[PDB]
Amino acid sequence: SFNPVRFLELPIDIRKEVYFHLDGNFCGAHPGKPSYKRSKRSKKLLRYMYPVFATYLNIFEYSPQLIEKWLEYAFWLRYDCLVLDCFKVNHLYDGTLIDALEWTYLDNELRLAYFNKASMLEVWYTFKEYKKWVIDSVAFDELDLLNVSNIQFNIDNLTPQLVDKCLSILEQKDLFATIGEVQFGTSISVIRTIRSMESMKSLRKITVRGEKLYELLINFHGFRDNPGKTISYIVKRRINEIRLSRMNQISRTGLADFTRWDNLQKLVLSRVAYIDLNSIVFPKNFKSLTMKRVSKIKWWNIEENILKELKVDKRTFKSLYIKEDDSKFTKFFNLRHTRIKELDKSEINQITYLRCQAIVWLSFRTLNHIKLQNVSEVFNNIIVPRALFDSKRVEIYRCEKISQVLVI
Amino acid sequence: SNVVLVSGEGERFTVDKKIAERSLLLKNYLNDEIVMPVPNVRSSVLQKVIEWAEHHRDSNFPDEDDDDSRKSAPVDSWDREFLKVDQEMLYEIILAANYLNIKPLLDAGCKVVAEMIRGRSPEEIRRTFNIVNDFTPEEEAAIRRENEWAE
Amino acid sequence: SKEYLPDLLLFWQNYEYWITNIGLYKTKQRDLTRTPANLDTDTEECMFWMNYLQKDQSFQLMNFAMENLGALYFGSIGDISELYLRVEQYWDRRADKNHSVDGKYWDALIWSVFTMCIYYMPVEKLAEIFSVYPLHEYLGSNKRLNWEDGMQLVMCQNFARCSLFQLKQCDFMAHPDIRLVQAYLILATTTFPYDEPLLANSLLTQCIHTFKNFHVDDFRPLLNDDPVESIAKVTLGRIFYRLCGCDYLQSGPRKPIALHTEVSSLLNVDVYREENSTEVLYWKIISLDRDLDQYLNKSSKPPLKTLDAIRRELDIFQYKVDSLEEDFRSNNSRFQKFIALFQISTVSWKLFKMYLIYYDTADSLLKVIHYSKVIISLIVNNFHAKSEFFNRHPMVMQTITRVVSFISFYQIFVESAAVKQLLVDLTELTANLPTIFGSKLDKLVYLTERLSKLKLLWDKVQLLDSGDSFYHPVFKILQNDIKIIELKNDEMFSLIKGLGSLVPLDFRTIVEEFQSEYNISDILS
Amino acid sequence: SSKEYLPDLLLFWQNYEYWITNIGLYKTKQRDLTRTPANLDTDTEECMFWMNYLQKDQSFQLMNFAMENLGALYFGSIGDISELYLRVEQYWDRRADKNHSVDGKYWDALIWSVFTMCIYYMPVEKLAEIFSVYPLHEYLGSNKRLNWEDGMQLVMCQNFARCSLFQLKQCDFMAHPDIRLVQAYLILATTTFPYDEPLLANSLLTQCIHTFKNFHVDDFRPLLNDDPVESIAKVTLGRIFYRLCGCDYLQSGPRKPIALHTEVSSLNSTEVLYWKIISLDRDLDQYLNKSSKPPLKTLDAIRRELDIFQYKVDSLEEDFRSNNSRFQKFIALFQISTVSWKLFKMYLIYYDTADSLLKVIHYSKVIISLIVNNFHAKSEFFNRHPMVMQTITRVVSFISFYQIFVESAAVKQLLVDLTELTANLPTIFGSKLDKLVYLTERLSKLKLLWDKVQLLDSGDSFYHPVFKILQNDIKIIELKNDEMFSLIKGLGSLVPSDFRTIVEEFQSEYNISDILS
Secondary structure (H helix, E strand, C coil): CCCCCCCCCCCHHHHHHHHHCCCCCCCCCCCCCCCCCCCCCCCCHHHHCCCCHHHHCCCCCCCCCCCCHHHHHCCCCCCCHHHHHHHHHCCCCCCCCCCCECCCCCCCCCCCCEECCCCCEEECCCHHHHCCCCCCCCCCCCCCCCCCCCCCCCECCCCHHHHHHHHCCCCCCCCHHHCCCEEECCCHHHHHHHHCCCCCCCCCEEEECCHHHHHHHCCCCCCCCCCCCCCCHHHHHCCCEEEECCCCECCCCCCECCCCCCCCCEEEECCECEECHHHECCCCCCCEEEECCECCECHHHCHHHHHHHCCCCHHHHHHCCCCCCCCCCCCCCCCCCCCEEECCCCCCCCCCCHHHHHHHHHHCCCCCECCECCECCECCCCEECHHHHCCCCCCECCCCCCCCEEEC | CCCCCECCCCCECCCCCCCHHHCHHHHCCCCCCCCCECCCCCHHHHHHHHHHHHHCCCCCCCCCCCCCCCCCCCCCCCCCCCCCCCHHHHHHHHHHHHHHCCHHHHHHHHHHHHHCCCCCCCCCCCCCCCCCCCCCHHHHHHHHHCCCCCC | CCCCCHHHHHHHHHHHHHCCCCCCCCCCCCCCCCCCCCCCCCCCHHHHHHHHCCHHHHHHHHHHHHHHCCCCCCCCCCCCHHHHHHHHHHHCCCCCCCCCHHHHHHHHHHHHHHHHHHHCCCHHHHHCCCCCHHHHCCCCCCCCCCHHHCHHHHHHHHHHHHHHHHHHHHCCCCCCCHHHHHHHHHHCCCCHHHHCHHHHHHHHHHHHHHHHHHCCCCCCCCCCCCHHHHHHHHHHHHHHHHHHHHHHCCCCCCCCCCCCCCCCCCCCCCCCCCCCCCCCHHHHHHHHHHHHHHHHCCCCCCCHHHHHHHHHHHHHHHHHCCCCCCCCCCHHHHHHHHHHHHHHHHHHHHHHHHHHHHHCCCCCCHHHHHHHHHHHHHHHHCCCCCCCHHHHCCCHHHHHHHHHHHHHHHHHHCCCCCHHHHHHHHHHHHCCCCCCCCHHHHHHHHHHHHHHHHHHHHCCCCCEECCCCEECHHHHHHHHHHHHHHHHCCCHHHHHHHCCCCCCCCCHHHHHHHHHHCCCCCCCC | CCCCHHHHHHHHHHHHHHHHCCCCCCCCCCCCCCCCCCCCCCCCCCHHHHCCCCCHHHHHHHHHHCCCCCCCCHHHCCCCCHHHHHHHHHHHHHCCCCCCCCHHHHHHHHHHHHHHHHHHHCCHHHHHHCCCCHHHCCCCCCCCCCCCCCCHHHHHHHHHHHHHHHHHHHHCCCCCCCHHHHHHHHHHCCCCHHHHCHHHHHHHHHHHHHHHHCCCCCCCCCCCCCCHHHHHHHHHHHHHHHHHHHHHHHHCCCCCCCCCCCCCCCCCCHHHCHHHHHHHHHHHHCCCCCCCCCCHHHHHHHHHHHHHHHHHHHHCCCCCCCHHHHHHHHHHHHHHHHHHHHHHHHHHHHCCCCCHHHHHHHHCCHHHHHHHHCCCCCCCHHHHCCCHHHHHHHHHHHHHHHHCCCCCCCHHHHHHHHHHHCCCCCHHHCHHHHHHHHHHHHHHHHHHHHHHCCCEECCCCEECHHHHHHHHHHHHHHHHCCCHHHHHHHHCCCCCCCCCCCCCCCCCCCCHHHCCC
C-alpha cells in the first residue's frame, strides 16, 4: 500500500536509486477468433485509444488475456506524479539513468513518446505541454538546464511515410536545435534522414545495427566521391560516440577504417562474433572503446612483438618469468575467475623494461577505457599495462572463460 | 578482532573485524577497541542490518559498477519477507544503508521497494493522480474534459 | 521560518572563497613610496648566516632529512647520498671567489634543502644543536627568547630570502635550468608563498617559463631512445606532476599564467595518464579537489552525476591509500600515509559540504560532522610521542581554516545539537597548533572570535523583511567585507598611483559601529 | 632535367628559412654552464662606474634631441616628455639620497632606459660633441685610438641597458610588479638588446606578461560616466598592450613558451595600424610545422586590403621640420612593402604564378629606393631602426636561394646591388651583420659547387651533395638546440651513390657552428 503523499520528500539520492532499479517497465503485466473484442462499451475507445497501439503492438492484437489493459491504463500514467517525477529527476541529470526518449509522429501533434525495453510505448507529451512544467519545475530561473538535447530520432520502427513526414515539420518551426542523436537498424528509410541532415547543430552520438549499412555509412575504405547521399564535412566535426550492436565480422572486405570522424571519443560495441582490432585505424584521439559479450578475440596480435623484442623463446618467456604473485591489492576486487600474470622486478629492471611499455603504449594509441563484459573464445593472451590495471580503467566483470590475463 | 559501534540513541554492538568490513565507511574509520557513531539509525533497524550482513558474509557479492547485475538480479529467497516488514521501516532501512555505505542492502531494499511499484493497480491511478498540484486547476478540469466518455 | 537557508549558503560560497583563500593569504598590498629599496643590507647579513652553519651540523641535519622526512624530497631528488657528495663539495667549495654557475645553482638547491629542513625541525633537537646569541648581537630587539618564540620563523624567512638573493646573484634570468624548479619544489613546502605571495608568483612564472620551454609532452620512454635519456625523461615527469600539485595550492588571481590544463573525471585540455603509480596519486587527489573548487567563484551549480563520480573514486582511493607497501619501523612511511589520509579526508569533506549547500541530500550534515571528527582524530593521534612534526605541513593551515570558518558560520545562524561540542573542541585544538605559523594562526583565531562575536548579534537584533528577503545588519556587513576585499585587491588604484599625478578617493549606527570596533582591513600587514 | 626539382627544394627552403635566418642566426645562444662566474665581482662596481659620464646639460640636450624626431617610438609610453623633464630633476636631486624609495628608482630605471634607446639613434657628429672618447678605455682597454664609429656605440648602449636592468634587479620587481617594468621593456627593447641577449629578454618579457595580464583588464573603450583619469589611463594602457604584443611577435620563437600573440585573432591616427599590419603578418608565416600549404582565398583578401592600406597613407601630409613625420611614414611604407613582398614570395613559391616575378622585383625596388633617399643629409638614423635587419636578411637569403638553382636575367643585378647595400649598412648592428655577410658568402660558394658537380639519380630519388649539406644544416641546428641535453646537464649526475665522404670537403671548411656563440 504505497502512498505518493510522501515519496517526494525522500532524499533525492534515494529517489534516484529507486528509479535506477525501475527501468522502462514502470508497471508489470507482460508476457477461429477473428478479433472479437468482448468489451462492453469500448467501440469508441479503439477509435481514439487503440488506433496506434494496433500498429505499434501487433503481437497483442489477439491478446488472450491483456486486451483491456493499455486502453484504460494510460489515461493517467502520463500524469501520475511518480513517473512525472522520473521526468523531473532525469532532466536534472541531463539524461543519464533512463533516457530512451525519441520522437514519433502520430495523432497530428508529434507526440514525444517514450518506449520500454520491448519497444512498447508508455508515455507521450507534446512540445508546449512538455516544457511548461516538466522542465521549468526543475530548472527554476537559470538558463543552462533549459536546453534539452538528449532526445533521439531512432528510425527503425517508424514506417517511412511517418519518417519523411516528421522531417518536414522542423524546417518551418525551428525545433532542429533540439534533436539529439539518431539510431539506425539499399534501405529506403535511412537515406532520407541523411540528405535531410543539413544543419541541426546538435548531434553527438550514433548507433547503427548490422553489417550492410555499417559498411556503407561509417567506413571510408578508400572512397571519397559519392555523388548524391552526402555525409557533408561541415557537420562531420560534431560526433563523439560510435555504437555497434550486432554484426558477424566487422572487416569482411579488408578493413574497419575511421580515417575521417576525427572528433570521435567513445566506441561502444556489443554482441558481435568477430573483432580483430588491427583492422581499426584508431583516430587521433579517443580515450574510450568498449565491447560487451564478444565471441572471437585476436587482441592486437602484439604479444609476440614483445617476445621478439626481448629476444627469447615463448617457453622461456613462460617457465621462469611468471611467478603468480598476490601481494596485497588484488584481494580487493573479487576476480577469482582470473589468473593475472605479472612480469619481473629483478631479472629485467630499469632497462629492457620501459621499452616494453613503449611497445605496449605505441599500440594502445591514446586510449584508457576498455570495459570488457562477458567473454568467450579469446585467442591471443590479454596484456594490460600497469597504468591501466592499477586505477581500474580495466574491468572484466563476468569473466567466464579467461585465463592468463597479464599485467605489465 | 571484535570491533564495536554505537547507535542513534547509544548501544553497543560487538560484531567481528571481518563482518564489519561491509561498511566501507567504517573502513575509512579503521585507519588505526574502537567505537563508531551512527546517530540516524535506531536499534532494531541496524539489528536487521547486522543480521543481513552476518548471514550474507557467507557469500560473494558482485562488482557494484556493472549495470548488468544491478538492473536485473534475483532479489533473494531470504530477503523477500525479511525486507517486507512494513512500508515505513523500509524507508528507515534505506536511509540507514545510505549512511553505512553498504550498497548491496541498499539495492536489496530497492528490490522490494521496486516490487511495491511494479504491480500497483490502475484504480489508485484513478484517484491518487493529483496529490501534488502540478497542473493548475483549470487543466486538471480539462484533462477530464477531453476524457469525458470512457468512464 | 527558515527561508534564509537557500539564499545563505551560496553567499557563504562567495565569502568562503573570497576571504579564507585570498583575503587571508594572497593579499600583501603595500604602498610603494614607503617601501625601502634593497641597495645593500639584504646582501651582507647572510655571509654571517653562512658561517653560522658549520659542517657537522649540516651532516646531522642531512641525517635528520634521510631518516624521517622521506616523503618530500623524493618528488625532487630521489636518492640522498649524492647530496652527501654535494655537501662534501660545498664544504670544499666555498674557499674560491670565482665560483661557476653550476656550483651555485647547486647551492641554490642545497640551501633550499636546509630551509625546508629547518622548517620541519623539532625544537627539542634544534635547541641542542644551535646557539641563540649570535643572531641577537646582530640585531637587537629582545634579549631573551628561545627558538620557539619566533626565531625559527625569522630563520626560515632569512634562509629563504637570501637563498633567493643567491639566485639573484647568479642571474637565473638568462640561464634556465631544472634546478631552479627543483629549488622551488623543495621550497614549496615552506610557508614562504604565504609570507611573500608576489615574489613567489613572479618566480613561479619563471618556473613555468623554465619548464614549458622544454617542449616535452609524452613522458613515457620511447623505443628509439637512450637509457640515460629514459631515466631523465621519467624524472622530468615526476617533477612535472609535483610542480602542478604545488601550483594548485598556490593558485588564485595573482598569477594570470597558470600551468594546469589537465582533467581527471571529465568524461585547452591536453594530457591524461602519463604515469602509472608511485606518487602520482597525490595529483589525482588534487585534481579531484580542483573540480570541486572551481565553483567557488562560479555562479553556476553542480550536476549531481559529477559529485557521485567523485564519491566513487574516493571509494577507490580508500583502498589506494592502504595499498602502499607497509613499513613497520620506517616513519617516513607513516608520514606518507598521514599525507594520504589527510588529503582523502579533506577533499571528501568539501564534497559533502557541497552536497549540503546545494542539494541537501541524506545525512549531509551528520556526514560533515563525521569527517571533521576524523580530521581531529588524526591530529590527536599524531600528538603524543616522537611524532609531532607532521602538523607543520602548510595544508593543515588550509583545512583548519576551511573547517573552522565553516562551523563558526554554521553556529551563527543554525543552533544544532552536537555541533556546539565540535566547535568548542575545534577551537580548543586550534589554540594547540604547532607554534610556527605566527601571524596567520593568531589572525585566524582573531577571525574565529570575530564571527563568534557575530553570533551574539544574530539572536539579539531582530529581523526586518521586505516581503521576500530578510534585512539584518549581519546581512549587510557580510557583503561589505567582500566589497572591501574587492576594493583592496583591485590594482587599477595602483595604476592611478603609478601613472600621471591625480589621486583617487536604523541600520547605519550599528553597521559602522561594528566596522569601527572590528575592522577587517587588517590582513594588509 | 625536367621541372621536377623546384617544389622539392622550394618547399624545403621555407623549413630551412625559419630554421636558419630566424633562430640559429638570431634567437639562440649555446651556453656552457660551467663558464660564467659570480656577479658580486665584475658586474656590480663597474656599473656605478658607468653612471658618471652623464651630467646635467648632456642629458638635457639628449632630451632636447629626443622630442622633435621620434614620434613613432616614444609615443608608445609617454605622450609629451614634460613629465620626463620634471622626473629627471627629481632624479638629479634623488642622487643625494642613500636609502631610496621603490617608485623613485623605478623612475631612475625608466629614464636610464630612455637614454639607452635615445643615444642609439645618434648620428655620430652630435654624439661627438655630447661625449668625450678618452675616459673609458682603461678597464675594457682593448685599444685607445678607436672612435665611436666602431665599438663604443655598441658597448656603451649595451652597458646603458645593463645599468637600467641593474636597477631593475636591484629594486626587485618580482616583489613589486608595478607597470613600469612593461614600459621599461617597450622603450628599451627597441634596440639590438634582444638579439644580444635572447635569454634575458625572453624571461623579462615573461615577467612583463605577468605584470600586464595580472591587471585583468578587458574593457578598453572610452566611457562617459567615469572621471577623465580613467579615460586617459585606459588610452595609454590599450596602446601599451598593442605595441607590447607586436614586440611579442618580433621576439617570438621556440625559446619563449608563454605568448599573448595567440590571444589576438585575425580579421593620433597613425599608431592604430602598426598593429594591423603585424596582425596580417602572423598568419603569413605560421605554416612551418603546419605542413598544409595555404589555400589562395586568404592571400588575395590580404592583397586587396593592402590597396586600401596605401590608400590611407597617401592621404597623410607631413610636416617638414617635424622629422617625427618622416620617421613614422618610413615605418609605414617599409612595413607595407615588407608584408607585400613577403606575401608575393608565397604566391611565387606555391602557385608559381606569372607576373608575380615582375611584381617581386619591383617590390624589392621600393625598399631600396626608400633607403637611397635617406642617406644624404639629416636623414640617416631611420636605418638603425631594427625591422630592417629582419627584412634585409629575408631578401638577401631568398634572392640568393633563388639564384643558386634558377638563373634570372636582371635579378643578379638586384642581388649585387642588394649585397653591396648590405655592405653599406650602419655599423650599429655589428656582429650579426658580419654573420649575415658570412652566410651570403656561404651561399655563393654553394652556388659554385652547384655548377661544379651535377646530379646523379638512379630511381626517382635525388642524390646530389648540396641537398645533403642543407639536410645536415637543419639536423645540426636541431641537435644543438636540443634542450634535453641542457636537461641532462641539468640533473648533471648522470653523465652526458657517391655519398660516402663528399661532404667534409665543405662542412669542415664552413661549419655551421660558425653561427652560434
